[PDB]
Amino acid sequence: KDQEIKKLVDQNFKPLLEKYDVPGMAVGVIQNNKKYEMYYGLQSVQDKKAVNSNTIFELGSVSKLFTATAGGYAKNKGKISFDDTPGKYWKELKNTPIDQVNLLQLATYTSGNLALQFPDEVQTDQQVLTFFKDWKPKNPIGEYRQYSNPSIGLFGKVVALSMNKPFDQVLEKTIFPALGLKHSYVNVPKTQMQNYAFGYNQENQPIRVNPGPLDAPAYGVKSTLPDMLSFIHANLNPQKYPTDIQRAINETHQGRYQVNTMYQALGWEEFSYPATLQTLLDSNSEQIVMKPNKVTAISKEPSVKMYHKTGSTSGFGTYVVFIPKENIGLVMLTNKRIPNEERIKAAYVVLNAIK
């Protein structure tokens, strides 16, 4: 039955490469503290270079899981409180309307007036500040979820301030080493550049992620399959990790509110396990991801939880899912974006099939 993991991944993930003309894929499963790595295709088409365990992929919004973790770590070191407001850490925002939004609300997208992206004209340090100064409320604060790069991006920048280090150094010098990660970066160094995949766009042109305002906390991490698998292992089995990072991790698992069947935890999305396929699919529906939705308090506290997160940049897809009580998880990394539904559906069949 260990011998079936490979066959399951070939049945469910492998056809997506022909169907979506994807150059390269890495799929990892972890089960009962045993890791399985499946690699497909090429990290770079023009160089005929294979996907392998050194291959670095862009994680996109799976990056928000690291930001959430950095938030949990800073809360439990007493550097921040989730009841604080950003003006306490970014002086220049004190007494402004955005300083009525607390850090949890920023992290969990409920400021009530923040869209998916910054405006394209917002780019520099000063334009970012200016944007947050000029910010004014729209929906009642804390009542409306709209998925948002600037919201969690500011939470990220506040966490770095509370730690007196820029955000990239928070991850690379504190958070990634505490998790045992060897090849995860906000900035891929010179000596690893030959391991960094090209991404491929919808016209199969090789591309990489562009700079943008507060990109690191929102979508700027790159990692390998083994690293991601270690991250899922941390999440599934955090007793082995330093106390500090354990408390951080636990903090990311606590659901804060519900949108019907989807609970919003810190970074992660949480569901009752077992979740139906449609529950997992509808979590990244146009309605949930693209438009405001009024949240409610958690009514049904799930006893057995599962967690997932999707991520995309223009050239890369990512999906990450784990279920504590089954001691199982999966990671998919592609260097071409494929529909979220496909990633979700393939992971559902594999994880169900293994028990």
Ligand X SMILES: *[B@]([O])([C][N]S(=O)(=O)C1=[C][C]=C(C2=NN=N[N]2)[C]=[C]1)OP([O])([O])=O
289 binds ligand X (CB under 6 A): yes
Q: What is the spatial distance between Cα 29 and Cα 118, in angstroms, rounded to a whole number?
A: 35
334 lines the binding site for ligand X (CB under 6 A): no
Nearer to ligand X, 210 or 303 (CB): 210
Bridging pattern class, strands 206-207 and 222-223 = unpaired
If the CB atoms of residues 221 and 229 are measured against ligand X, the closer one turns out to be 221
302-305: long-range pairs with CB below 8 Å, 24+: 302/255, 302/263, 302/270, 302/271, 302/272, 302/273, 303/272, 304/272, 304/273, 305/253, 305/255, 305/270, 305/271, 305/272, 305/273
Does the footprint of ligand X cover residue 54 (CB under 6 A)? no
Closest by Cα among 266, 295, 269, 301 to 282: 269
Binding mask 132-161 for ligand X (x = CB under 6 A): -----------------x------------
First to last CA, the chain: 10
311 binds ligand X (CB under 6 A): yes
Q: Where are the beta strands (DSSP E) in 82-167?
A: 144-145
Binding status of residue 67 toward ligand X by CB under 6 A: no
User: Which residue number, 246 or 284, has a Cβ lying nearer to ligand X?
Assistant: 284
Q: Write the binding mask 197 to 216 for ligand X: x where contact by CB under 6 A, - elsewhere.
A: ------------xx-x----
Residue 217 found at the interface with ligand X (CB under 6 A)? no
User: Which region among 71-79, 150-158, 230-238, 307-315 touches ligand X (by CB under 6 A)?
Assistant: 307-315
Residue 349, beta-bridge partner list: none
Q: Which stretch binds ligand X (CB under 6 A): 75-83, 159-167, 272-280, 308-316?
A: 308-316
Question: Given the complex with ligand X, which of 80 and 265 has the nearer CB atom?
Answer: 265
Does an H or E element contain 292, and which?
Answer: none
Shortest reach from residue 222's CB to ligand X, in Å: 12
- Least spacing, CB of residue 307 vs ligand X, in Å: 14
When binding is defined by CB under 6 A, the residue of 109, 185, 196, 219 that contacts ligand X is 219
Say whether residue 310 binds ligand X (CB under 6 A).
yes
Cα distance between residue 23 and residue 162, in whole Å = 41
Q: Is 312 in the site for ligand X (CB under 6 A)?
A: yes
Q: Which residues bind ligand X (CB under 6 A)?
A: 60-61, 116-117, 149, 209-210, 212, 219, 284, 289, 310-314
